[PDB]
């Protein structure tokens, strides 16, 4: 009624007050905080692995794969440059049909970037083969088009041990696999090598294991986590299937230092911790988030550190080494002991984030309002 609008107004106040108190506390909570309004909101964020370090400078140049979300206008695949100590610029804009749901670089050659669109084709771009400045026609000339899905989705994951092997999750209940290793010179469209059909609802994410080249995991709106092996001759049924959450599962992340461990994040407002050797039993539930979680990512530097983000506008950082520690009921009120940090700088749903791989503790998070933040919590919070 006019009650819906009283609620909206109260809620604006709430967000605004929260952002005021956050802003006053920044000098105590961060070693670094940069905020940039992008031209459009980005649904995706990934640091590229390279870092250039010009002579005589007190800063290094890092890079970010980003995207746009615009209804009416021309969308772009984007690469931005960030300066960090020992400011922000766009460097390439590539025409993209529709918004960029996810964009991810191939480890074995990070010029190569795969995207997910609102259409069913999964696109591959080589950004060294497009002009810095996009043709005004607005035509999307991707280097490959990968076929197999019937709908859009998010999950996208390159195999870091088998060059060119890409996995994708879709709203069509399907995971697709491609091998773009070796692609005939007259060939631009590539068909799926395998399609996995074990889910019975929207498949939200997929990821390759980091050491075992055949292994990968998936999560879906059927509330299941599925562990799959590509060596198997049955693609309708995973090696393992667990009932992970009490609502949709949106994300997963394998721990890069602990080969049996992974985390999942869900609309049930939790992150779950898992051990592949025994999937019946969830190891742990990380609770603190107030609404649906969309992204989960392990720290690339510390085996016990994990972070998650989503709809409640927060990005939480966790440390599993503190699970079980006792606490005064005063500390207990703020959250459990494994919650290290609540990033409170965004005033909209967080869509994606990425841990910087060359600068420990630096994270890039992006929200629906068009804000990009590059930040780093204060050292004394994770050390002594």
């Amino acid at each position: 009624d006019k009650e819906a609008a009283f609620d909206d107004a109260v809620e604006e106040r709430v967000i605004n007050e929260e952002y005021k108190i956050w802003k006053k506390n920044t000098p105590f909570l961060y070693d670094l905080v940069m905020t940039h309004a992008l031209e459009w909101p980005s649904l995706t964020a990934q640091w590229l692995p390279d870092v250039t370090r010009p002579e005589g400078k007190d800063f290094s140049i890092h890079r970010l794969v980003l995207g746009t979300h615009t209804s009416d206008e021309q969308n772009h695949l984007v690469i931005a440059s960030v300066q960090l100590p020992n400011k922000i610029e766009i460097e390439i804009k590539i025409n993209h049909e529709g918004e960029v749901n996810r964009a991810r670089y191939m480890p074995q050659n990070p010029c190569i970037i795969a995207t997910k669109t609102p259409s069913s084709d999964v696109l591959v771009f080589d950004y060294t083969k497009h002009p810095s400045k996009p043709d005004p026609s607005g035509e999307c000339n991707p280097d490959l088009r990968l076929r197999g899905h019937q709908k859009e989705g998010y999950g996208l994951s390159w195999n870091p041990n088998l060059s060119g092997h890409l996995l994708s999750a879709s709203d069509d209940h399907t995971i697709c696999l491609w091998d773009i290793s070796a692609v005939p010179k007259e060939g631009k469209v590539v068909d799926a090598k395998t399609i996995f059909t074990g889910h019975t609802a929207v498949v939200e994410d997929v990821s390759w294991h980091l050491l075992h080249e055949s292994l990968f995991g998936s999560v879906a709106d059927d509330q299941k986590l599925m562990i799959w092996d590509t060596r198997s001759n049955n693609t309708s049924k995973p090696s393992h299937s667990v009932d992970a959450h009490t609502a949709e599962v949106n994300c997963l992340s394998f721990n890069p230092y602990s080969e049996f461990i992974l985390a999942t994040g869900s609309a049930d407002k939790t992150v779950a911790l898992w051990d592949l050797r025994n999937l019946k039993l969830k190891l742990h539930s990380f609770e603190s988030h107030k609404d649906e979680i969309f992204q989960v990512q392990w720290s690339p530097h510390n085996e016990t550190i994990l972070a998650s983000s989503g709809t409640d506008r927060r990005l939480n950082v966790w440390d599993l080494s503190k699970i079980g520690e006792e606490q005064s009921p005063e500390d207990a009120e703020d959250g459990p002991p494994e919650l290290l940090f609540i990033h409170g700088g965004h005033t909209a749903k967080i869509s994606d984030f990425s841990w910087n791989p060359n600068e420990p503790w630096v994270i890039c998070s992006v929200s629906e309002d068009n804000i990009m933040q590059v930040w780093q919590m204060a050292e004394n919070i994770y050390n002594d």
Binding site: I21, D331, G335, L340, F341, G344, A378
Partner: peptide, 12 residues
């Protein structure tokens, strides 16, 4: 120290 606490209370 209570620098920990502030970290878990960004909105206070």
């Amino acid at each position: 120290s209570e620098t920990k606490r502030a970290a878990r209370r960004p909105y206070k």
